[model samples]
Target: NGRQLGEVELQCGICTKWFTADTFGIDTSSCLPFMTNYSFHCNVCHHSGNTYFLRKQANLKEMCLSALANLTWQSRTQDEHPKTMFSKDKDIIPFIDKYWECMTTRQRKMTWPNNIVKTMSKERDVFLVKEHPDPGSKDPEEDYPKFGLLDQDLSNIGPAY
Candidate 1:
């Protein structure tokens, strides 16, 4: 039992600035604690949203996991026919190498032209592989998933696949 969102520092992406629960604007009296992980808005850009205000997104590796999810999801789900968050090869090989194993093993091999790798996990195998807004297209709702950990009802994939 402790301050959940406030327990750790928070930051907003639109503001490109860092903040804390004290800064995010939620009343901490009702806060809850969790193991994984938002916001309260960026002051600089006048961006007012619960989703855009996020904590660190990229991994410590800072590897492009989202890119992989798009590629994997895109190629994996063409027949499924639904929206996605972010995708391709040669030009896309690097995308594959880093995220294949969640960057667990083959990330280092992805530098420039040396990448030749294989995927480690299968569909639904990873902990929280996401499912969203069409790769590279900036839909207004694009950042909603960043707030996902905060809201239980928000699913990465639609129709629960």
Candidate 2:
């Protein structure tokens, strides 16, 4: 596994908690060099939810600009800090746009802009929640079936881990 970098933040499709890239698992089948496991349900969400629910990327264009606006010298050199994994310049907008295209189109693994940080929830599996928060869905019929044919594990009937 690659070391943790401030590359992206993932929100639980269930609990909506914010976490960094490393705390969750990635879909290696996508052959991605960075994190893109939207199927992941963190330990807390997993215990109660029991199965993975396919998640859509929250926002692509705004996400890219957020990361670009926050770039700093430390992001390039620090191990735990953010990394664009490409040249950092204002002219790099198209590059971010290209990356967004790859992610939104599922042509490549999805990655988030490095804007969020792990706070209290970084405690991961060890953290405690008195009750499970509601993880509502808009349209179960439309959203649930996309992962239907994609699921290989007949038992779980969810996306790949």
Candidate 3:
């Protein structure tokens, strides 16, 4: 097995400063969603002492739903949610992308506008199809045979039908 090596480069939306993932206090190898996503502010912007930040004045519902989950670490069922420790020697590629997919896919329940476009920059490349290309045909059943079991009732049924 080979070792993983890479850096999580990120930029601040508020200050517009560039910084590595370590600026957030966690290791760069952790590769948490908050470090790479564009929705979050740098540590300086969200500091406890800063009260009159410009970004705080904006009236936004939720520009990024995925960021919300990454920033918060609360337990849903009152159970302890342990802090995930990334192994130094183990392959971390599986945890990186899979964790991101699991988090972003939850927003699929929202309206099409939000669910469809993940980022503003990629909006030009994205298109919304009015109808599905392969919706399948609605065919009328010609068979009139009835049995106690549904489709799985008879093992002797021929495959021609």
Candidate 4:
């Protein structure tokens, strides 16, 4: 089911002295895109107070599912305009509130000014006209108005891209 690295020699071929060696294993059959499975073991001499560290295998899929469920709960509660997510953990309220205040202030400073609307409109018209189909273009699709989702598409219509 998985690769296994059994006990193997840790001796140096030139010096004939023992040194530490690590073994690792992985089961990739159930892996998600860009995900990896891993395990590790270390071997060292006993007189050197050799120790072994073992990390319990984590079920990544289960962890991700749990996180998704928590996010869904949070989203539902937010939609209902609940008091707060951490009402049960009120002890951290001061810290969270301060952090939120700092973040909002920073966002406000980075926001566009009132004059940005006219400037952006002129820029958009110029750019769109430049990229518009050349006169007497034969393709009807080129003349068709592009349609996109309002919230998703309109938000990033103009950018450094």
- Provide the TM-score for each candidate, comma-separated: 0.23, 0.33, 0.27, 0.16
Candidate 3 colliding pairs, count = 0
Candidate 3, residue 152: lDDT = 20
- Lowest summed-lDDT stretch of 10 residues in model 4? 152-161
Model 3 bad stretches (over 4 Å): 1-6, 27-38, 47-161
Stretches of candidate 1 exceeding 4 Å from the true structure:
1-52, 55-57, 60-64, 77-93, 96-161
lDDT for each candidate structure: 0.33, 0.35, 0.29, 0.26
Q: After superposition, how far is residue 145 of candidate 1 from its true place, in Å?
A: 29
Query: Total backbone clashes of model 2?
Result: 0
- Best-to-worst lDDT order: 2, 1, 3, 4
Ranking by TM-score: 2, 3, 1, 4
| Residue 133 C-alpha lDDT in model 4 | 35
lDDT of 3 by residue, 1-161 (tens): 11111234344456655455554564434244323223445667766633221211111112222222222222222336621221111212223234544323342232433332233223322211112122473422232110111122111211111
Mind giving the per-residue lDDT tens digits that candidate 1 earns over 1-161?
12222243334434444444555564444222221123324455554434343323233212333343344444444647543322223323455354444323333433533221122112224323333354896654534322011112212311110
Query: Per-residue alpha-carbon lDDT of model 2 for 1-161, expressed as tens digits?
Result: 32233444444565654455444454423222232335555667787644353544524432332333323223545658543322322323444554454344444423332321121123333222212222673433322111001122112211223
Least well predicted 10-residue stretch by lDDT in candidate 3: 144-153
Question: How many clashes (backbone N, Cα, C below 3 Å) per candidate?
Answer: 10, 0, 0, 0
- lDDT assessment of candidate 2: 0.35
